[PDB]
Design a protein around this ligand. Structure first.
Ligand SMILES: Nc1ncnc2c1ncn2[C@@H]1O[C@H](COP(=O)(O)OP(=O)(O)OP(=O)(O)O)[C@@H](O)[C@H]1O
Ligand SMILES: [Cl-]
Ligand SMILES: [Mg+2]
Length: 312
């Protein structure tokens, strides 16, 4: 990937200067891979603060941003994202604008990793309260993004991170855009198996457009992930034909430990009409009420070999 930085709009280059982190401020430990996902690779990094204090960070390469036009748009979004501050939204510390690679985002290192692994771990023992509480934190972070008219596009439990205080931080907002654009219009992905279709709203699968209302659908799937302690949604449905599955009149089953009013909320998030789905503001209100009724005595028991659903 070669990016001709002299081909960027001068006013943009000036406008994003305060977001850009230079090589003398950042070491990316490329031999210390954290992992790879849908649209990038994450590495350990070391950032210097204003006082020259050493800061542990995570650095993500955005590998599907490969062309000047895509870099340009990303920079505009970087300026917007840098200004976000909310306890349930992962900070953007800055960006690396490279001439010989895809651009990087510099993120605070999240001590306790992602929410999906945190709940899946068999040595952890979450209660219904704990799981709903995590969902409330995610709803709050999404309520903030929605207030900024900022579409996530890749919301899922894997993209909610936990910091040293166990505060949930919604992560990877906006960054899936170019990967989606390319994979929707690729002769190598006509099946759609390269995309996270299990979290996508019906209308997003059909139209390739993403909105805050489509994030609400993803949030419903995220709640299902929470209440099953990280089960994979819809096993053996990983293609655009999830649309066929959905249109037969189907939704994810109620997890055994999912309270009835929370399952009602999930069904609202998957309303066929996007405009009839609750806002994140409404979701925070409703989930705060359901959360308040629990006292942390109902341990959620799951097993690796199957998903336990409501039966009695
Ligand atoms: N700020 C961070 N601190 C620590 N680990 C991180 C951070 N950001 C991402 N990771 C981890 O790096 C790995 C890869 O992240 P990446 O975001 O590319 O994939 P993902 O989150 O699994 O899926 P997606 O591509 O849908 O985001 C994951 O293990 C992820 O939890
Ligand atoms: Cl409980
Ligand atoms: Mg991610």
């Amino acid at each position: 990937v070669h990016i001709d930085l002299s081909a960027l709009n001068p006013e943009l280059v000036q406008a994003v200067q305060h977001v850009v982190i230079g090589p003398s401020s950042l070491i990316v430990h490329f031999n210390e891979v954290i992992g790879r996902g849908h649209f990038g690779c994450v590495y350990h990094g070391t950032l210097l603060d204003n006082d020259g204090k050493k800061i542990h960070c995570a650095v993500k390469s955005l590998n599907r941003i490969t062309d000047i036009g895509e870099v340009s748009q990303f920079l505009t979004e970087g300026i917007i994202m840098k200004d976000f501050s909310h306890p349930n939204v992962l900070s953007l510390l800055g960006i690396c604008l490279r001439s010989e690679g895809s651009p990087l985002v510099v993120l605070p290192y999240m001590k306790h990793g992602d929410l999906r692994n945190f709940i899946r771990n068999e040595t952890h023992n979450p209660t219904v309260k704990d799981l709903i509480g995590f969902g409330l934190q995610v709803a709050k972070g999404m309520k903030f993004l929605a207030s900024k008219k900022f579409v996530h596009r890749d919301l899922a439990a894997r993209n909610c991170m936990l910091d040293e205080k166990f505060t949930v931080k919604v992560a990877d907002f906006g960054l899936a855009r170019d990967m989606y654009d390319k994979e929707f219009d690729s002769v190598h992905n006509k099946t759609g198996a390269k995309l996270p279709v299990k979290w996508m709203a019906l209308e997003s699968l059909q139209t390739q457009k993403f909105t805050t209302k489509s994030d609400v659908w993803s949030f419903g799937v995220l709640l299902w992930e929470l209440m099953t302690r990280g089960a994979p949604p819809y096993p053996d449905v990983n293609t655009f034909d999830i649309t066929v599955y959905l249109l037969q009149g189907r939704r994810l089953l109620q997890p055994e430990y999912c309270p009835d009013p929370l399952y009602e909320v999930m069904l609202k998030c998957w309303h066929p009409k996007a405009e009839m789905r609750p806002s994140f503001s409404e979701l925070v209100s409703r989930i705060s009420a359901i959360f308040s009724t629990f006292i942390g005595e109902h341990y959620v028991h799951v097993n690796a070999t199957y998903v336990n659903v409501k039966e009695g």
